[PDB]
Amino acid sequence: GVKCVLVGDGAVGKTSLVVSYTTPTAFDNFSAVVSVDGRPVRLQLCDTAGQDEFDKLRPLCYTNTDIFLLCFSVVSPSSFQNVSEKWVPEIRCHCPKAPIILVGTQSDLREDVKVLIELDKCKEKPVPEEAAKLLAEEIKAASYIECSALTQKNLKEVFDAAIVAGIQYSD
Numbered sequence: 070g071v072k073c074v075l076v077g078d079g080a081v082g083k084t085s086l087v088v089s090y091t092t093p094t095a096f097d098n099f100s101a102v103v104s105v106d107g108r109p110v111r112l113q114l115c116d117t118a119g120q121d122e123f124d125k126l127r128p129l130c131y132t133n134t135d136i137f138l139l140c141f142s143v144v145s146p147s148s149f150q151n152v153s154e155k156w157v158p159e160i161r162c163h164c165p166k167a168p169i170i171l172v173g174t175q176s177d178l179r180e181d182v183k184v185l186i187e188l189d190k191c192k193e194k195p196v197p198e199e200a201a202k203l204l205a206e207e208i209k210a211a212s213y214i215e216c217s218a219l220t221q222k223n224l225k226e227v228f229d230a231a232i233v234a235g236i237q238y239s240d
């Protein structure tokens with residue numbers, strides 16, 4: 070059984086990722102049995118609040134973590150910038166050994182006019198997939214995987230990858 074913790078800025082879609090996949094509050098735990106490469110594995114999902122108010126409690130959730138899903142929204146460059154500035158340092162402070170998968174969320178919004186118009190008011194654009202992939206390399210993430218809890222694009226893949234990385238580490 071594999072312990073997976075999701076971290077990242079508020080509003081990127083952490084809670085939505087886990088609920089979409091496994092099917093109303095700050096911190097919550099989920100448990101699912103998942104078929105990975107043909108055999109069942111128990112996956113514990115710990116959903117954390119990403120607001121600065123925490124690190125109060127948040128790192129208390131980290132004990133014995135096998136895999137971190139470090140999430141940013143692909144339509145939030147600020148959340149991408151926080152991967153380097155806040156999240157990788159925090160994870161590495163508490164669990165320096167644990168594998169990380171860099172997870173880009175809300176992929177469907179790359180094609181949402183309202184969202185794109187809003188980003189452009191500050192001359193921003195969605196995070197290029199190339200940039201995410203390069204960062205994943207820089208931070209020594211296992212991989213970069215981009216997904217949508219709305220359309221379920223790559224949602225299975227995110228958690229399959231989490232389990233594979235998590236078993237390898239655990240073992």
Ligand SMILES: Nc1nc2c(ncn2[C@@H]2O[C@H](COP(=O)(O)OP(=O)(O)O)[C@@H](O)[C@H]2O)c(=O)[nH]1
Pocket residue numbers: 077078079080081082083084085086174175176177178216217218219220
């Ligand atoms: N369009 C779209 N909206 C999403 C997606 N994932 C989450 N949301 C919405 O984004 C907001 C933040 O989601 P939430 O699960 O609360 O994020 P968290 O704060 O990181 O846990 C909510 O309005 C969700 O409905 C997605 O993949 N696509």
Ligand SMILES: [Mg+2]
Pocket residue numbers: 083084085094095
């Ligand atoms: Mg949430």
